[PDB]
């Protein structure tokens, strides 16, 4: 077969094994297909659904807009037909809820489990996040026994530095009998992933890949302060080099541009447009520049006011009053939207809704909006292409470009998607070209050990940590990489052992000396050529010695004058001195030519004809000695016998002072410690002339060889390291260390049996969030006498890694914080004690205390407005922190329960009741 169009298929088979057997036919059909129609299937869908129908797992690799969700539906239907259960894991928050709404309306027998809520836990199809899958798995719930199929939507999130590990963990933990549908972006090494699944779960895994986009993209560049946009990638995906070149020239010649771009987009009916930025602040800034315009008809204005109010009706005439709403509404009314994680969740949803219904023509959003469900536009504008990964500025990866740009082009309603990238004031071509002809990044494991992990593996009879390491995807990519690396290492060793033909050990001395001279000579040029020490002595006729650009020697010359041109940026390189020198190789220039260094002028002399003596211009970076003498120069100094005549007076002075000519100390009086750090540089210059090598001609041959050997040695050491971190033992060191920690702290015995404290520590699941320390805290007490509302605030002290400002701490609050920071200190201690790369101070200091009072007063009954007034943290971030906090609290009630402190557990529940109220207890618009 049937349909055909740029579709690649592959299959993964388990490692032998593959020996017996079970053949006899087992080759189609074999079952009927549920919910085929309505629309005709695309061949890539047909293929993947065939894989699923045959009960074989399959990884689909296609762009997000390509319609991957249809395949998920089929597995659910098939599961529902066989009275089986299926699990839809979504990577993150809101979209799982949305997908739940879609599946609920479709299949009815559907439930939802997130951090915030639980729906229909007996349903045949459970939508849940990966993290909950991890917890429920470690807990070993019997539900998992009935599960036949797991669909992973957006599986490429396994490459996430903090959350990828969760994905991997739950994959490894599933029973081999289970089958998987992996939905992914067009990653390049899908096959490898399939193969890993095949090995570890002893079953086939198909891979369906295709380079298919329903609506094609055109990419345009806008240079900053430029006059328009340049098409740089056309519908056929052909790169137009020349326009890029023109654009960069448009930037070499070169706030408000965003407004002009939007106005242009408006004039040509390219709306709706998503304008991406990478900071909430930048988002609001951009909206301010935009806000002069108005994109809605009075009827549209009416429509959005009606929809908005219809959403707000559930709240109250006091919640309606937060200034984020009152002053966001005039923007919405003008047809301008904003979207970022700082807004209230209810605004994120209602703004999404107003965008989907076509009431918002321009939407300024941060990256996260790019992965929202079914919300594309006609045009996408990148406000920049630089993102901080930390103390570095990254040009956004191809995968990011794909993911964001995929929101352009609306399948039903648009002929094409228009993508306009505003460019940075400075940018090299190879990086941009790499992005726009984007090759997707590997799905490389980001596995790392965690305390909840290790503890849980140890806790269960039939499984072990060593197992997990052996079966890890990271390790699989290692066991793949290693033979290539040992082959590189061997090639390097051969080159090393083969280039060892320079002989001598005087070379080593030479290298050391040369580099020492370059550094010390740099010190000497520095400061001594600076006007602050050197300048004052600018009399006419004074004899000065010239440093020469690199290291040559034009000898002593009489200063003629000194000029300084300002437009010449280093301190030393600024003043220009005209000096008379005993020039020979002229040639270039004539009189005044140049410029950057005297150029063509060759020193000496002695072997001249043709000596000349002329006044040449040099800059102040070029200097060295200044000497202590001045001759009287004639006022009319432009004649053969007279320039050369001054020269005659110079040779006679030089003949009069052997072992001289004595020089001016430049630093003495506007000391001198530097001089004793100055004679040695000369000594080393004598060591150089002493070296037999200095004369031979090979020289540079032997030197470049020495360099190669030293480089190769460094590279080799590095390769042995890469091999070490390609070997399971690196991570195993981390493991043995963490085992030391667990013994020394008392969570498990030396016989590797989990204790009650380990068992309670198990039930705390947080991204990096110490999880240990809370357990220690409990058994150490430090919670016995706190009221619930106080306890809330203290627990709030662990989730916020964001910045807030401006408050003092009362003593009755500063002290418990201090005591916990003390516990953190003992823990980071034992951590260093056990060879962990933990930086003992950053751990201890990671528990930020500046938000204790906001949460405390919220827990004591303050209204939302007031606590929003007590900090600069964004409203949405605040509600997010509360939501993690509630989830955390449920976890703490659990661990208290599982250590029999019934009183603590009930207390935490009561705390939940204080926190879990009003807007913080808000249900989702989708549910």
From TrEMBL:
<comment type="similarity">
    <text>Belongs to the helicase family. SKI2 subfamily.</text>
</comment>
<dbReference type="GO" id="GO:0003724">
    <property type="term" value="F:RNA helicase activity"/>
</dbReference>
<keyword id="KW-0067">ATP-binding</keyword>
<feature type="domain" description="Helicase ATP-binding">
    <location>
        <begin position="49"/>
        <end position="205"/>
    </location>
</feature>
<dbReference type="Pfam" id="PF21408">
    <property type="entry name" value="MTR4-like_stalk"/>
</dbReference>
<dbReference type="GO" id="GO:0016787">
    <property type="term" value="F:hydrolase activity"/>
</dbReference>
<dbReference type="Pfam" id="PF08148">
    <property type="entry name" value="DSHCT"/>
</dbReference>
<dbReference type="InterPro" id="IPR027417">
    <property type="entry name" value="P-loop_NTPase"/>
</dbReference>
<dbReference type="Pfam" id="PF00271">
    <property type="entry name" value="Helicase_C"/>
</dbReference>
<dbReference type="GO" id="GO:0006401">
    <property type="term" value="P:RNA catabolic process"/>
</dbReference>
<keyword id="KW-0378">Hydrolase</keyword>
<dbReference type="GO" id="GO:0005524">
    <property type="term" value="F:ATP binding"/>
</dbReference>
<dbReference type="InterPro" id="IPR012961">
    <property type="entry name" value="Ski2/MTR4_C"/>
</dbReference>
<dbReference type="GO" id="GO:0000460">
    <property type="term" value="P:maturation of 5.8S rRNA"/>
</dbReference>
<dbReference type="InterPro" id="IPR011545">
    <property type="entry name" value="DEAD/DEAH_box_helicase_dom"/>
</dbReference>
<keyword id="KW-0547">Nucleotide-binding</keyword>
<dbReference type="InterPro" id="IPR001650">
    <property type="entry name" value="Helicase_C-like"/>
</dbReference>
<keyword id="KW-0175">Coiled coil</keyword>
<dbReference type="InterPro" id="IPR025696">
    <property type="entry name" value="Beta-barrel_MTR4"/>
</dbReference>
<dbReference type="Pfam" id="PF13234">
    <property type="entry name" value="MTR4_beta-barrel"/>
</dbReference>
<keyword id="KW-0347">Helicase</keyword>
<protein>
    <submittedName>
        <fullName>FRQ-interacting RNA helicase</fullName>
    </submittedName>
</protein>
<feature type="coiled-coil region">
    <location>
        <begin position="878"/>
        <end position="905"/>
    </location>
</feature>
<dbReference type="InterPro" id="IPR014001">
    <property type="entry name" value="Helicase_ATP-bd"/>
</dbReference>
<dbReference type="GO" id="GO:0003723">
    <property type="term" value="F:RNA binding"/>
</dbReference>
<dbReference type="InterPro" id="IPR050699">
    <property type="entry name" value="RNA-DNA_Helicase"/>
</dbReference>
<dbReference type="InterPro" id="IPR016438">
    <property type="entry name" value="SKI2-like"/>
</dbReference>
<dbReference type="Pfam" id="PF00270">
    <property type="entry name" value="DEAD"/>
</dbReference>
<dbReference type="InterPro" id="IPR048392">
    <property type="entry name" value="MTR4-like_stalk"/>
</dbReference>
<keyword id="KW-0539">Nucleus</keyword>
<dbReference type="GO" id="GO:0005634">
    <property type="term" value="C:nucleus"/>
</dbReference>
<feature type="domain" description="Helicase C-terminal">
    <location>
        <begin position="257"/>
        <end position="461"/>
    </location>
</feature>
